[PDB]
Amino acid sequence: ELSEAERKAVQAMWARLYANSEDVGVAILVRFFVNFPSAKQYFSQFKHMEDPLEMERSPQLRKHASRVMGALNTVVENLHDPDKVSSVLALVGKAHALKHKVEPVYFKILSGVILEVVAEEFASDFPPETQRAWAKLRGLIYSHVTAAYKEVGW
Ligand code: HEM
């Protein structure tokens, strides 16, 4: 789990992100789909879309952006309550394993894009203590999502 200082570091960072949650979520996903075109295969309204301006304006992209940011928000705000973070990430993990059939490695890829976007957009607020805290959060997400895939015999 995150230590108290790490949790505080992650929540303070996340608050800055979430002040324009909508735009940050979308910028993250556009970068994800441009840089990893294979990930678009799970999205019916944009699986063959290439123009990043259209991706930015895509209703189904912006919707998934809103749901990624909201589920992340739930995890970050409730990091002091580890049963809640377990709860949320299971539900996500399973859902993506079973309904959406997404290869679990795409979570690792998306997290790397999330890191790249955070490092760019909020660099002057991203000291090493915070970078390390954020990296623990990423590990936490990937291990919990990865355990949920194993749980239903992926
Ligand atoms: C931090 C990681 C992610 C979070 C928190 C997240 C969150 C969500 C949530 C809350 C939903 C709506 C409920 C549901 O139908 O499951 C959703 C839908 C979906 N997600 Fe994710 N997601 C993540 C990563 C991914 C990745 C990497 C992919 C595939 C590359 C993906 C593919 C989908 C698809 C195909 C849907 C259905 C969208 C639709 O109904 O049009 N997600 N996501």
Swiss-Prot record:
Heme b binds at residues 64, 96. Transmembrane segments: none annotated. Coiled coil: none annotated. GO terms for cellular component: cytoplasm; cytosol; neuron projection; neuronal cell body; nuclear speck; nucleus. Its EC number is 1.14.12.-, 1.7.-.-, 1.11.1.-, 1.15.1.1. Keywords: Cytoplasm, Disulfide bond, Heme, Iron, Metal-binding, Nucleus, Oxidoreductase. Residues 1-150 form the Globin domain. Belongs to the globin family. This is Cytoglobin. It comes from Homo sapiens (Human). The gene is CYGB.
